[PDB]
Each structure stands twice: as structure tokens, then as C-alpha cells.
Amino acid sequence: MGKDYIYAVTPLLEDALMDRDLVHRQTASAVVQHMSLGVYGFGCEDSLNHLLNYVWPNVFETSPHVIQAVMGALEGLRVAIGPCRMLQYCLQGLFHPARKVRDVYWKIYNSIYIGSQDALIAHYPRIYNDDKNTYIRYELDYIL
């Protein structure tokens, strides 16, 4: 029965995810986690998308509690919003120059993969084939 007050509460969480403090963003993230697990399956996915926009920047963080509540928010948000949306958030930073960003994105993508590794089969991008390998999946584009 959060499908009712999700709208009332969003502009307060976006308010507190635009900084106020570490603990401010740690706590707004916990709230996002539990909203997502409650509203699983009732269509209030536009609101959780909106709040993804604000939670995802905290991904580069260091404090244990803060980054941990962030990761929790992203597992909740993974079941509630689906694994396409989150694989798309996780696409570009898998192969980044840096190593702090490579490592956080591979941490996330690992947890997105463990749970729901089987949806992703229809969510992976199209990755062209160079000379001595084959990389396209022709299985999937047989016409019929």
C-alpha cells in the first residue's frame, strides 16, 4: 500500500538526494530501497526512474554506510524497475579508462548479474564482430 504515497514522497527524497549531508543521502537511499520493494508490480516505475537519476551519482562514494545503502537501493530498484534500465545505467563504465570507476561498475554489474542473469539475455547490446572473431548473434535475428 505504498502505491498511494509514492507520489507524495518523491519530491522530498529528491530534495534530500540533492546534497544535504552524507547521512542525508544514506537515508534517502534506504527509503528508495524499501519503496521499490513495496511497489514491485504496481506500475509506479516512472517515479523510481526519476529517483534513479538522483541516486546513481552517489555511486562513486567511499564511506562504508553511504555506499552500502546506495548498493541496497540499487538491488531493490533492480527488481522494481527491471534489469534493462539498470544494465543501461551500467553499460558505459564497464570499460572505462580509470580503475575506480571500472571497479564500481563491475561490482554493480556483478550483483545485477547474479540475480536475474537470465533476463539479460534479451537486454545485451549489439557488439559488432571484427576480423578473427564472431560477436554478433545471428540466432536472434533469424526472421520468421
Partner 1 sequence: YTIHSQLEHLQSKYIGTGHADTTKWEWLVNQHRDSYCSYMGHFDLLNYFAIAENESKARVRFNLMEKMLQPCGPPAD
Partner 2 sequence: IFCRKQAGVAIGRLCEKCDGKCVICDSYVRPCTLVRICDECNYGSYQGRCVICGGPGVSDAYYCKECTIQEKDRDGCPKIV
Partner 3 sequence: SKKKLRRMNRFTVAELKQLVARPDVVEMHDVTAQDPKLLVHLKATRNSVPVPRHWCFKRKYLQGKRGIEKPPFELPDFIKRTGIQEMREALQEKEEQKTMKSKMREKVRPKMGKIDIDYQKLHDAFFKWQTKPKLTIHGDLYYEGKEFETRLKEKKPGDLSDELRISLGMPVGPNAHKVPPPWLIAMQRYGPPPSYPNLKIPGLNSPIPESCSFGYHAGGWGKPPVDETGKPLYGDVFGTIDRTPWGELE
Footprint of partner 2 (CB under 8 A): 33-34, 37, 40, 75-76, 78-79, 115
Choice from 19, 97, 110, 138 touching RNA (CB under 7 A): 97
Q: Which is nearer to partner 2, 38 or 101 (CB)?
A: 38
Residues in the chain: 144
Contact partner, 115, from partner 3, RNA, partner 2, none, Cβ < 5-8 Å per class: partner 2
Name which of residues 97 to 116 contact partner 3 (CB under 8 A): 97-98, 100-101
Task: Return all residues near 69 (Cβ < 8 A) that are at least 6 apart.
Answer: 26, 27, 29, 30, 33
Q: How far apart are CA 78 and CA 135, in angstroms?
A: 27
* Residues contacting partner 3: total by CB under 8 A: 39
How many C-beta atoms surround the C-beta of residue 14 within 10 A?
16
Per-residue contact string for residues 117-136; x = within reach of partner 3 by CB under 8 A: --------xxxx-x------
Q: How far apart are CA 68 and CA 72, in angstroms?
A: 6
Long-range contacts of 98-101 (CB under 8 A, 24+ apart): 100/60, 101/60
Give yes or no for a contact between 30 and 72, defined as CB atoms under 8 angstroms apart: yes
Given the rule CB under 8 A, which residues bind partner 1?
94-95, 99, 102-103, 106, 109-110, 113-114, 117-118, 120-121, 124, 127, 129, 132-135, 137, 139-140, 142-144
